[PDB]
Paper text:
The human mitochondrial AAA+ protein LONP1 is a critical quality control protease involved in regulating diverse aspects of mitochondrial biology including proteostasis, electron transport chain activity, and mitochondrial transcription. The LONP1 protease consists of an N-terminal domain involved in substrate recognition and oligomerization, a AAA+ (ATPases associated with diverse cellular activities) domain that powers substrate translocation, and a C-terminal serine protease domain involved in substrate proteolysis. In mammals, LONP1 is a primary quality control protease responsible for regulating proteostasis and various biological functions within the mitochondrial matrix through diverse mechanisms. Here, we determine structures for human LONP1 in three different states: substrate-free, substrate-bound, and both substrate- and bortezomib-bound.
To test this prediction and characterize associated allosteric rearrangements, we determined a cryo-EM structure of substrate-bound human LONP1 incubated with saturating amounts of ATPγS and a 10-fold molar excess of bortezomib. Density for the bortezomib molecules was clearly visible in each of the six active sites, covalently attached to the catalytic serine and positioned within the substrate-binding groove, mimicking a proteolytic substrate. As predicted, bortezomib association with the protease active sites led to their reorganization to the active form previously observed for bacterial Lon. Importantly, the protease domains in LONP1Bz switch from the asymmetric conformation observed in our substrate-bound LONP1 structures to adopt a sixfold symmetric organization. This suggests that the presence of substrate in the protease active site induces rearrangement of the serine-containing catalytic loop, such that it extends toward the neighboring protease domain to allow formation of the proteolytically active S855-K898 catalytic dyad. Despite small differences in the spiraling ATPase conformations of substrate-bound human LONP1 and LONP1Bz, both structures show a similar engagement of a 12-residue translocating peptide by pore loop 1 aromatics. Intriguingly, we were unable to determine the interactions between pore loop 2 aromatics and substrate in our LONP1Bz structure, as these loops were not as well-ordered as they were in the substrate-bound LONP1 structure, suggesting a dissociation of substrate from these pore loop 2 residues prior to or after substrate association with the protease domain. Although our structure of LONP1Bz had bortezomib molecules bound to each of the subunits, thereby symmetrizing the protease domain, it is possible that all six protease active sites of human LONP1 are rarely, if ever, simultaneously activated for proteolytic activity.
Residue numbers in the entry:
A (entry chain C): 592 to 789, 796 to 947
B (entry chain D): 415 to 596, 603 to 788, 796 to 947
C (entry chain E): 421 to 597, 602 to 789, 796 to 947
D (entry chain F): 592 to 596, 602 to 769
The structure:
């Protein structure tokens, strides 16, 4: 329904406003019948990817219910319970002639198929199965086994391999978490002195940052000045120094109001000459007086943290319900700290 | 009344489903009540013409002999390894399950690499029926879904016309240029295994079964394809050929076909392998053999003229007399700098037309309060930001390495990337720019045959880049004997053919300190 | 009726079509709309020639004599046509190619098509795709609409009564908004064998047609079209070339069109060189043709009105026929001051010469700057920045005491501030202008240079050497500086274009400095 | 001819002198020779769709009129025709020369006479009303009551300065 054409001649999304009226379905008037037809017993089901492209009068008649993506465990279950059997029925293979063990499927999900859907996992599964079928029917083998070592001989080279730019963080960088369609994502915030001395200072940002993210950098810079002034009143860093802030992978565009606390921590660690805790990610919008504000995409950020080997995660206190609605296996080995003001993040990170 | 018989006879060799038969009976009984002069009779007869010209059960008898199909594929095109392996697996599966099937593939790669001709070769190898279908610049959904019978200029759209032309229900449809489509939400239904089995053309108003059509889409890039449409179809890369593959193609497919097209004989017109290598190396610069075909055809045309006109009885083209046919070389430089001055460094880039070699020049804008860096050369925003990152890191590195230089913090520098008319972009050349700045600052030149590529971060980390094959080929062609790649491109480099990485002393790096110790 | 097809070799599918439409025609009745629409459909289907080719004379020497006598110059087109004839001989069949001539306005791209079709004895059709925006003007309407016409290629096949008629498609640069799809399928060797017009559903073959296309610039053509056709360059002419064209072709044609003959109206060659140098500024002979037509028309009037029995146009009375001599300058500066240098530019209309002026912007010898005006593109502004940097470096290494270009505030202007201009060339020109201003020296007096410059001084190739050289010759220059890598482009020019030109091929700017001073 | 909508190819064939002799119309099955008719076509802009017309069409440019030529045209052709159309005559309603020059200079500045025509018709209608109603048995227009006929002047003094101070200089647009 979010893909109907609003052409110059024809807007069917305005003729839907009568077909989907919970009260006026009982008399839906067709232009050929010229007789109202009772449609109140029909179960209409619409499907969409984005909700904002539907007009609000129409979006109000529907009961929008959400079909979320799948985490790695759900994907493994989906695979070994629906995809591999259906792939065998299609490619006509048997369980005894080519077996995809749970270790191989877990590796395939972990390295190749990372999005929310389950449509690329299907393609990799049937790729493996059709390569096995060609080995079998051509006489090159009578039975094929797929192991986590010869898997790259079937599907190619891994797509995801690193998960972490910095393994030990220097005194200027700090790990932040991002939302992506390919699962979560981990990103760092580098800071560096730009001029040969510790007339006021300045901050230059790079890394394809949107406008909201540039404003977040400005706010974080101002609050970092204020905080370092109240904390170590004689530091004079961040007041006279010329800083450069970079969010690496400078080719991909990134935006959002999060990473406020991340930028504050980067600047403070650069000013104090101290690295932050060595396995610590954080996400949260900062305000001008230091308040830590809620963020979005908690499931993806927590997944990415746990996947990059993070041991301590920091979230805003207003995301506690978001965090505790997560499944048990997602948030089991993470030392989470919920915060309201930044001073708590500072105490955690040092 | 005879038209009732003509319609009832067309459905004799067909196995028509029940709903189509209901619609046909209704429309026939209705037609048996109209007047041969009213428009109702015309539209009902058109509907019954289109309803019966659908091959409701007619499949083609596919060739499922793996050896015969492999021989058919291998003697039509050259070296399209992934596509041939895919089609062989397709045959293997259709043979192991005993029944025909259908898939949705997408061949993407640079222009002129035989994407749209391997489709015909595959249709011949599979004994299917072939249909061309272009979508580039299309804007009307009624070309895919058709209009109601009510309107006057109402046709059933392109897929129904395909099924009527090919007369089989499992053709091979080549949906050409899906990356340049102007309209695209109809393809989301056309090629989707869920909805594919009941495809609703708005003219027919009766669903067809496209579940056994082999769809093949072609593109040059995958970035302009909508995300759900990329989610539907399977991507298979058809990359461009190296000079040796271009030579094999010219020797085996391009010269014989151009002789056939020019009406020559092998004894009359001859082209040695040296002439073909000269053409490939100097008169054409692209990824696939498309301009090479034109050069070959030109040479053979001028040979045909020298024969028919009465000059000679046989033409024997040599690397000497090749000028008299195609003129003078077009791409005979291969490198801009032979000995790099103390401030220029050789970088690597690539495009759809292969790889290239570009130099990063730096100098002083003013003699001998901080410094500035002006960059020129038609750089995109990503490249300008990479230049800023490189400037900051070079300042810091020179501060920690030679603390008493005072360069790079007090000097005004201009950075240029020649070919100032060509727009350039990308996060690579960060290390190249750092090396250029440091070499200008220290007054030293870099190693003499050295190229480097890699994105740098603010603390000096070297990040992976793309197009290792093309950059390596271009560096090898430009006479480079030492190449510095990011460490995380090690598998990309080692998955290259042996004849590319033969004489290259490659170095994989993670931090810039390693590149500095190499280049100095 | 069925007699229009006994001379034709009708395919089988179209035979079924005409049979079923005859059945429909017979079952229907007169004075009815359907009767008339089926009558029109059958008339169009029986008017298409379904098996006939025109007798094409593949004789080489006769066709060369035909081509060489009605068109001066244009060696590439005639060589390509002769190779086409040779290949048609070897193949034994009548074949078809797809060609495209591109060049400045009025250089013979359209008349060479007619003379070519006369040489090959094919038929001839021309129609422009300039302003068209809907594809029905090519593919035709549908037989159901109230007013139905089968397009503009079926009309060709019907009126020419042939299957290889040499369709000329003029002016394919101009295209509305995209019928380029219909164009490409019409110009595709894989989609030509089956055309499938919209009015008549049955396809027709076009693989024997010779499609010639004319354009002014290749870049406005879509990139898809830029691969289904070869590119032959029809180039502009020089004064003597234009004069030969005039005498041999324009005066006889315009005269025979006006009615007079060789005795009643003459034009001395001096009058023609006047109409070429002054009354016209172009690379073609279009405006020259208009001037000759105007002269001969006023002559015809003076004859019939009884003022004189014969007219002899001389330089003494040309004003009475055309008026006053526009274009009486031919170059901005005659003797350049210390600051200005002549550069060469080009465009689709042909070559052109321009100057680069510099000046002080503030009164003295805290660093200097450089304002740049002249409606310059982005690449040209960047080239000016590069030139500024390299000029400062060079003046420091060569005259380390000048201090100009370091403390001076300069303004650089390229005159005709109304016309926009772009390009990486004129970098060496800008360097030379800055250095001549800083040294207070004027460059050599008849000297033009073209070439991209790099930050270290290397001289990089440029484009359009032919047109720039034509324009420099016409503006009366004696020396010319080119990049060393454009030597192969320069030595493809005819021997009469580069006669009084002293040429220098350079690689670094130091050579340009030695030449200009 | 530039306001035409296939009529384009139809005209292209019609004007051709090799297809001129045989113009078969859909009504009369008999052909008719049109090789003796003379064809003229007018337009305003030469940016119409067919270019091969302009190869066969001979373009002639009709320029505008300066105020003197417009005044002469108005006194010789326009005012007589307007009088005929309004039923007046030179004795009843008179338009002197100075009022016509004033009307052209202050109301109608385009290159044609399309506006001056409507202006003189306006004057003559007001005059017809004034003589029929009975306000005046004969009307005489004069540069001090023309605004009572056509309203407010469109153009103005045309000189912002009469004596230029040290800073200002007059250019032409
Ligand atoms: N490996 C090959 N073997 C034989 N012929 C080849 C090969 N590669 C290219 N060709 C030749 O190239 C010609 C044209 O290639 P084709 O048009 O299929 O390229 P393409 O990738 O489809 O281009 P585009 O993407 O622009 O459509 C064909 O005639 C084909 O014979
Ligand atoms: B944050 O939650 O807003 C976050 C900031 C990040 C740069 C540290 N941004 C994102 O997660 C965005 C999605 C988004 C979420 C909420 C508002 C606006 C945007 N994604 C990315 O920034 C991103 C980063 N790297 C790669 C891909 N996407
Ligand atoms: B690099 O990979 O980012 C490289 C840097 C180069 C300018 C030294 N850029 C390119 O290779 C680009 C392609 C590209 C890569 C990544 C993102 C976006 C674009 N190629 C060119 O800039 C280019 C320029 N001239 C000729 C050929 N290619
Ligand atoms: B040069 O070859 O790039 C040249 C430099 C010129 C500005 C002194 N540029 C041009 O000649 C351009 C065409 C062009 C060339 C290369 C890239 C882009 C464009 N032509 C003009 O600028 C021009 C301006 N006025 C009149 C005629 N031509
Ligand atoms: N070599 C030549 N011999 C005779 N006429 C020529 C020659 N070159 C150009 N012309 C004249 O040029 C005109 C055709 O120009 P054309 O190719 O139509 O330019 P365009 O199509 O770009 O406006 C004709 O009048 C023709 O007489
Ligand atoms: Mg293609």
């Amino acid at each position: 329904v979010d893909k109907i054409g609003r052409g110059y001649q024809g807007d069917p999304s305005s003729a839907l406003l009568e077909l989907l009226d919970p009260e006026q379905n009982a008399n839906f008037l067709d232009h050929y019948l010229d007789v109202p037809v009772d449609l109140s017993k029909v179960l209409f089901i619409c499907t969409a990817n984005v909700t904002d492209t539907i007009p609000e009068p129409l979006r109000d008649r529907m009961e929008m219910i959400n079909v979320s993506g799948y985490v790695a465990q759900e994907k493994l279950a989906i695979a070994e319970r629906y995809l591999v059997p259906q792939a065998r029925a299609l490619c006509g293979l048997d369980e005894s002639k080519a077996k995809l063990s749970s270790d191989v499927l877990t590796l395939l999900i972990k390295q190749y198929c990372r999005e929310s859907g389950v449509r690329n996992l299907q393609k990799q599964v049937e790729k493996v199965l059709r390569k096995s079928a060609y080995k079998i029917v051509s006489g090159e083998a009578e039975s094929v086994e797929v192991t986590p070592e010869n898997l790259q001989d079937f599907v190619g080279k891994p797509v995801f391999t690193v998960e972490r730019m910095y393994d030990v963080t220097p005194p200027g960088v700090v790990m932040g978490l991002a939302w992506t369609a390919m699962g979560g994502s981990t990103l760092f915030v580098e800071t560096s002195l730009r001029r040969p001395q510790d007339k006021d200072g300045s901050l230059e940002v790079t890394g394809q940052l949107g406008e909201v993210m540039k404003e977040s950098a400005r706010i974080a810079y101002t609050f970092a000045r204020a905080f370092l002034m109240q904390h170590a009143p004689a530091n004079d860093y961040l007041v006279t120094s010329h800083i450069h802030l970079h969010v690496p992978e400078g080719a991909t565009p990134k935006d959002g109001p999060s990473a406020g606390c991340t930028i504050v921590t980067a600047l403070l660690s650069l000013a104090m000459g101290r690295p932050v805790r060595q396995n610590l990610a954080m996400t949260g919008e900062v305000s001008l007086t230091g308040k830590i504000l809620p963020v979005g995409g908690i499931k993806e950020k927590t997944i990415a943290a746990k996947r990059a080997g993070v041991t301590c995660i920091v979230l805003p206190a207003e995301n506690k319900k978001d965090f505790y609605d997560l499944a048990a296996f997602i948030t089991e080995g993470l030392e989470v700290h919920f915060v309201e003001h930044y001073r708590e993040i500072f105490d955690i990170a040092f | 009344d005879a038209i009732e018989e003509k319609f009832r006879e067309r459905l004799k060799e067909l196995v028509v489903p029940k709903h189509v038969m209901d619609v046909v009976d209704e429309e026939l009984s209705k037609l048996g009540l109209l007047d041969n002069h009213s428009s109702e009779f015309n539209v009902t007869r058109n509907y019954l013409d289109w309803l019966t010209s659908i091959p409701w059960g007619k499949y083609s008898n596919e060739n499922l002999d793996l050896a015969r199909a492999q021989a058919v594929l291998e003697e039509d095109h050259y070296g399209m390894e992934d596509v041939k392996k895919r089609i062989l697996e397709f045959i293997a599966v259709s043979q192991l399950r005993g029944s025909t099937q259908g898939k949705i593939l997408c061949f993407y790669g640079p222009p002129g690499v035989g994407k749209t001709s391997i489709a015909r070769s595959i249709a011949r190898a599979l004994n299917r029926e072939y249909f061309r279908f272009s979508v580039g610049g299309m804007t009307d959904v009624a070309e895919i879904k058709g209009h109601r019978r009510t309107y006057v200029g109402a046709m059933p759209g392109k897929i129904i016309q395909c099924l009527k032309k090919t007369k089989t229900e499992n053709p091979l449809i080549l949906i050409d240029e899906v990356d340049k489509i102007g309209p695209s939400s109809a393809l989301l239904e056309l090629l989707d295994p869920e909805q594919n089995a009941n495809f609703l053309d708005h003219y027919l108003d009766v669903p067809v079964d496209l579940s056994k059509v082999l769809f093949i889409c072609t593109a040059n890039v995958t970035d302009t394809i909508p995300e759900p449409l990329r989610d539907r179809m399977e991507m298979i890369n058809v990359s461009g050929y190296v000079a040796q593959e271009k030579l094999a193609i010219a020797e085996r497919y391009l010269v014989p076909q151009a002789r056939a097209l020019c009406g020559l004989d092998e004894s009359k017109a001859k082209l040695s392998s040296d002439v073909l290598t000269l053409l490939i190396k100097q008169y054409c610069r692209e990824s696939g053999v498309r301009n090479l075909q034109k050069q070959v055809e030109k040479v053979l045309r001028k040979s045909a003229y020298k024969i028919v006109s009465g000059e000679a009885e046989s033409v024997e083209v040599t690397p000497e007399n090749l000028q008299d046919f195609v003129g003078k070389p077009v791409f005979t430089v291969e490198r801009m700098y032979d000995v790099t001055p103390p401030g220029v460094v050789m970088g690597l880039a690539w495009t759809a037309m292969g790889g290239s070699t570009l130099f990063v020049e730096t100098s002083l804008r003013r003699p001998q309060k901080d410094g500035s860096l002006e960059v020129t050369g038609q750089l995109g925003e990503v490249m300008k930001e990479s230049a800023r990152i490189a400037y900051t890191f070079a300042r810091a590195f020179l501060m920690q390495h030679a603390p008493a230089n005072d360069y790079l913090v007090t000097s005004h520098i201009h950075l240029h990337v020649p070919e100032g008319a060509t727009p350039k972009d990308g996060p690579s050349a960060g290390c190249t720019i750092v090396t250029a700045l440091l070499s200008l600052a220290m007054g030293r030149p870099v190693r003499q045959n050295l190229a480097m590529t890699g994105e740098v971060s603010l603390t000096g980390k070297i990040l992976p880049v793309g197009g290792i094959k093309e950059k390596t080929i271009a560096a090898k062609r430009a006479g480079v004997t030492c190449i510095v790649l990011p460490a995380e491109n090690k598998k990309d480099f080692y998955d290259l053919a042996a004849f590319i990485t033969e004489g290259l002393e490659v170095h994989f790096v993670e931090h810039y300190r390693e590149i500095f110790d190499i280049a100095f």
